[PDB]
Design a protein around this motif. Sequence first.
Motif, PDB file in Angstrom:
ATOM      1  N   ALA C  12       0.803  -1.219   0.000  1.00  0.00           N
ATOM      2  CA  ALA C  12       0.000   0.000   0.000  1.00  0.00           C
ATOM      3  C   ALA C  12       0.839   1.274   0.000  1.00  0.00           C
ATOM      4  CB  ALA C  12      -0.940  -0.001   1.196  1.00  0.00           C
ATOM      5  N   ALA C  13       1.619   1.501   1.053  1.00  0.00           N
ATOM      6  CA  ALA C  13       2.555   2.618   1.117  1.00  0.00           C
ATOM      7  C   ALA C  13       3.964   2.082   0.906  1.00  0.00           C
ATOM      8  CB  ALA C  13       2.439   3.354   2.443  1.00  0.00           C
ATOM      9  N   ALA C  14       4.616   2.532  -0.160  1.00  0.00           N
ATOM     10  CA  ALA C  14       5.764   1.840  -0.720  1.00  0.00           C
ATOM     11  C   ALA C  14       7.030   2.665  -0.577  1.00  0.00           C
ATOM     12  CB  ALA C  14       5.515   1.498  -2.182  1.00  0.00           C
ATOM     13  N   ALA C  15       8.074   2.048  -0.032  1.00  0.00           N
ATOM     14  CA  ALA C  15       9.432   2.574  -0.089  1.00  0.00           C
ATOM     15  C   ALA C  15      10.191   1.764  -1.136  1.00  0.00           C
ATOM     16  CB  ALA C  15      10.112   2.505   1.269  1.00  0.00           C
ATOM     17  N   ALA C  16      10.430   2.372  -2.298  1.00  0.00           N
ATOM     18  CA  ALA C  16      10.951   1.654  -3.453  1.00  0.00           C
ATOM     19  C   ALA C  16      12.439   1.373  -3.297  1.00  0.00           C
ATOM     20  CB  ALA C  16      10.689   2.439  -4.729  1.00  0.00           C
ATOM     21  N   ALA C  27       8.176   4.972  -8.511  1.00  0.00           N
ATOM     22  CA  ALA C  27       7.147   5.374  -7.557  1.00  0.00           C
ATOM     23  C   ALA C  27       5.974   6.076  -8.217  1.00  0.00           C
ATOM     24  CB  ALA C  27       7.753   6.267  -6.486  1.00  0.00           C
ATOM     25  N   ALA C  33      -0.232   1.005  -9.845  1.00  0.00           N
ATOM     26  CA  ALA C  33      -0.758  -0.349  -9.824  1.00  0.00           C
ATOM     27  C   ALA C  33      -0.942  -0.870  -8.413  1.00  0.00           C
ATOM     28  CB  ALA C  33       0.149  -1.291 -10.612  1.00  0.00           C
TER      29      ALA C  33
END
Lengths: 181, 50, 94, 107, 195, 51, 189, 537
Positions: C12-16, C27, C33
């Motif tokens: 859901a909340a992404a640290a790439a 990001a 997606a």
Amino acid sequence: LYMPYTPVATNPVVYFDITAEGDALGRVSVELFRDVVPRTSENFRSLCTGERGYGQCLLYYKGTPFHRIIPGFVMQGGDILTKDGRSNVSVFGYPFPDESFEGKAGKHLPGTVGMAHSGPNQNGSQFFFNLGRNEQLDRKFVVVGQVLGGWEIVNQVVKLCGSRCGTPVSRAWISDCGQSG
Amino acid sequence: SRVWVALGGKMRRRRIGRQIDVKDMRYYWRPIEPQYQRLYMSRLRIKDHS
Amino acid sequence: AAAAAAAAAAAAAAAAAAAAAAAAAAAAAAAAAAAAAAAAAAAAAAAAAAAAAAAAAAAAAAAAAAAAAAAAAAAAAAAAAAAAAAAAAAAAAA
Amino acid sequence: PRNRYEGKASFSRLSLSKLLWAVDTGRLNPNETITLYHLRNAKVIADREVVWPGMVLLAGNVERVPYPLHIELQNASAKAIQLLEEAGGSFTNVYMSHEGLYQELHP
Amino acid sequence: MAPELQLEYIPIIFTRTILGPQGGFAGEERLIKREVAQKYMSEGNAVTPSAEFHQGVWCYNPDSEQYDRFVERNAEFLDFAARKRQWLDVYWRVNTGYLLFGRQSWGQGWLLNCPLRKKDIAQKLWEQYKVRVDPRLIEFREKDRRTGIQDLGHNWCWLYLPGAEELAIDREVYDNKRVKVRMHIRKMSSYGALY
Amino acid sequence: GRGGSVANPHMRSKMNFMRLRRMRLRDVMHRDQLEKRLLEERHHALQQQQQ
Amino acid sequence: YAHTPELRHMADGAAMSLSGQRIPLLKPTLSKWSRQLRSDIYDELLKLPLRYALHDFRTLQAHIHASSGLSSASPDAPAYYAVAGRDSAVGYAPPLGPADPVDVIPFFVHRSSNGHLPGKVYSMNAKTLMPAFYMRIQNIEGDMFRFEEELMKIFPTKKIFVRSHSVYVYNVNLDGRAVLHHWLLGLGF
Amino acid sequence: PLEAVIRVQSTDAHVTEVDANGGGAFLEKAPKGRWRKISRSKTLLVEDTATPFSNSDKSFSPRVQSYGEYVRRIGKLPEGRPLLRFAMFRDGYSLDSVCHRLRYEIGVPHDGVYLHEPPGGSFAAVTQFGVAVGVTREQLPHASRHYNVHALIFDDRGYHALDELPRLSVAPQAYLHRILLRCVSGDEAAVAQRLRHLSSNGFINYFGLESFGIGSNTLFDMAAFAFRREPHRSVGAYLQTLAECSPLHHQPYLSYANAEESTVAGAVAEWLRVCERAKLPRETRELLRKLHCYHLSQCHPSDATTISMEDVWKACPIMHRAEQSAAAFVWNAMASQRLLSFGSRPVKGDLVCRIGNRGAIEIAEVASDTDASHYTIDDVVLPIPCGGTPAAELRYPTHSVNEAFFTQFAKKHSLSFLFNSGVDPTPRAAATLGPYRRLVSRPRNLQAAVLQDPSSCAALKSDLFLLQEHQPTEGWSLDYRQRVREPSNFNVSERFRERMSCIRKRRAGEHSVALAFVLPAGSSPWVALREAFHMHY
RNA sequence: UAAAUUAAUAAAUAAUUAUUAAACUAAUUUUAUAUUAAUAUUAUGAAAAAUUUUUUUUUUUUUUAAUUUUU
């Protein structure tokens, strides 16, 4: 007791793991004629590979027992459904017709695995090993293959579990079935 | 498979507290309750009923 | 992918975490997606025994549909067939 | 969330595979610089699709274009551009104001 | 795998057959395994097995209010043990127990429409206490010897434990020869019970 | 009669259906052979003319 | 086989977005415009008992000499003159005609003004967006009843109906559309 | 022999390398890897109160979207120390499945690592090792399987000079095998009997069956078929053991195995499509490409180029079968000649004592018939031949009666298999085997425990727990204080408890024979205890 | 045919009846079995104590048919 038989490659070769009286007998490798009968060889080999999804039954020979063993005439098997031998199914989802009786599929030589049918036309899932020269089964039952190895085993079953009527005095079955080559 | 996502998470405006801004609202869209999507969408179908 | 942990939520909340590519659009394609609950993040198949969840709504619906008398009895309280008939109805209002 | 304020450049998607299917069907003559006028007149795309700004050429599930092709569209995607450039053909991005679209579609 | 400490089954001093007052007995050993019930070991009633203790133990005899009377652990003793305990193990259940009856009674009942046989009760004692018994060892109280049990509410009758003398078991239980079994017959419906 | 017990009444219907289809098929496959046999021979009359 | 911790990559196409490299290894790719073909689907049609011998998957391919060979669009030897309807990276190619030169197929399907094939997957009661789809084969011609029969040998368990213009096959998603074309392609139509 | 069932869980066995440097590798550390945030936590000002947007006094709390991009956080090189002798823990991960995990994550080339696959050899058995690689220390943890089950993890001792690449990675001196057995038949007494004869009298040091593959088509049937001039007999033989190895390759093969002559090269394409998606070492798997180019050189020979079956076999993972596996088959066949010629008492006969000479000592007590028998009785240990063609090179113990019984049969048509390249340029030419592969051998420091009543199970605690237990990992033998896990309903699965049931039906017996021994280099452990128990799986 | 119920940061489905559609396999009589989705429908109202009779609301016409004894 040697089985003469016609040798050719590039054909579906299927193996069975027979077991009578709960006694591990051995492997029986069949050579299917994909040269003259493409369809019947594909319905047969498919039930032996077990790759087809379940349709009217669980299309797979592993476990089903031979059920009509006439000593010296015919050893029947198959019977995916209703393990006594009263139901003929097929992987195409319907009993399908017989292709050809012209060459290599008209003569039921002792080295042969016929494709038993209920009606003369609508073949199914039941096969049989012609143990003798069945002069009458010509062009009635489409021959589909011929045993390559293990001819002693089908010669064991037809003796160990046999009766002129047909019912097996002991339960000979297919402990596993798979494609060989 | 039309889903109606709405922004997710709490909304209260506290006093001068809010010592974490990093684990603050994760800004995720999460789809609304399955009933209400049919409640709103019901107003949309009636353009041509029957 | 076998889990053996307290696995996680999804992305859901992404640290790439990049390795090497064009990659100048991660990001902006990792939050594009992520809202349709999706792959293009590879979805991290976890929890191989998700059968016990298919066997809960198997029981939590066969024990709450039996809360209204599961009733392989009949059309309940027949007592007037079993002679012979074709049952008509009884509107519920209840 | 998707407020389409005035000026927001939201193109109407045109599949590239819908184009390569209309030049071998015979609607588009690959000799000529294919523009928005032909598409509308070749009935390749309806006119309800075209709203300012015109279109966008997207190359998805397409990997090769055999004949050279010369196209005037508004902001084809990256791989849509590379495909056309790799085939000898070319592509340009004719982005124009509204009255440019009208002065072109109805010449 | 005999569970690690979910079971111990350690030899015994005294007083199994838990009750409020449960030490009703005279000089033997029989118990339930002290798995977490090792609370016994605290102040007697069970002793950890040892190469010594497997010869004998100081079972609590109640005569002196201490584990005085020695006792051997030969064959006859262990033979005598279960034969003795199992007797009052039947006594402990039917005395402290209370067997309910889902029965049928039509109209405003006050009475059962199919009175209780003796084989009827001798099914419950086995059903609910797992106590197997001879039905003829059940003697209905002197009120209803001619009409079964037949009544709702709280009834009782006399199950007859014969074996009181061959095991030398007196003064520990208030009736050496018969034990009052207490019943409580409900009125269950057609869905309730059969008969 | 009433072959076996299948879960739903739909699964009883869509099982009796594919039993009313294997009858249709078996009638069509049988008519298909007489178009496959009639072919092979008439497919030979041309070749048999060549030898 | 969880010892290989990879294979997570093979996952689904349901409950999760599917696009680009991650397209399902069973789901076909034949769209309205990109007439892609598959060999898996073609064996099902070639190992099924039917009349009308399909076309060999060899002579069915629209996709697999001045400067060491030139493309199939007849770019001519000068590496100059080329011809309009000869190469198509989208999978388009005219019919090939029936494969058996001794048989008279009883039905003739008619491609549409844009070169399609008559199967279109609709939905039952699209108003409520119900995910129950059927097909419709609108351009049939000839003995459309002997066309219904061949569909049974492919689709034995689908409720197939027939009217004067169309042939409905029920409960056939976008996949049974693809499987239909490979038949009408190999059939020479 | 008494029955036994093994390798039913990943850690039914246990292996830790003991290198030639002395102290074997024992794992106590597990760094998770260091990263480096590169950008700062993109956020967004989202409304957080129902006021309209006209209010000058709106609230607008900061909800986060991305914490920030990270990077591998590469490090330094120690100013002249490219090598990295590091430890690792590969539980159930074959070397191919970790030679590709180092490349899936960091990108260590295949030519980088130097990891001697532990003889025996069984792929899925827990293992502990020391390796050598030309990478830094900070990037190696980035390849581990930390937060997973079976936990393949790396950790660095490392940083040796480039000239220290020969001295390291020489060969593992020995191997500490801490095995445990299931569903065994004999009680505590019978095992002690059968094992004291194994610990003392030793075992026929055969070559394990892992090098040949337990499949319908062994690795020689590819080194032979590729040389009968029939390459397509080798390729299909290779492709078969893939369809037999993993479910991933089975159905694609059976579709290709019997696809139409019309639609072949599609089944190989739809085979390449699945192996590519479920990302395989697509680099090192180029055989399915060539096959697809072989079936396209027919079926439109003019539209695509021409490819032969030999071209396909050219691009194959070979050199497993050609040398180390083909020249292992006939080796066992030589022992079968020094067991026909009874060898328990060394049968010199003509007093050809071994002249391998193994340094300053380890000649086979080169002496008379009775004066060699000084210790050659004890010295039944002897390299029977070399591996392949140098069978005549050693042929040491006997009159070479074995040699003369197979050499007339070796180069004629390859004694046992009837096919083998014993040609002039051969393992005789090369010198990379150095076969001291001894005939009889014995385990070292046996006597591990035995459970009479594990009616259902018993896991063996292994180098990932003891590290995390805060426990010293080096035990050097069956500890049984740790590492034993006597049955308490904790065999770490509920599914494996199903494996026990449907395997307790067919084969029944109390079990949990724990085991431990220090088998030298070579000498798969199964083939060691092959004589003691009747291994089943 | 009475069943449902959690105000409010990352936890599989409200329930009912209804309309319209959908699929049989590790899972036995050669038994038996109404599961799933989409949409339509959320007001039929208990306070204490005690506790860890029965199946009927609904029948096409001719027959046929096993539950009766007083104080």
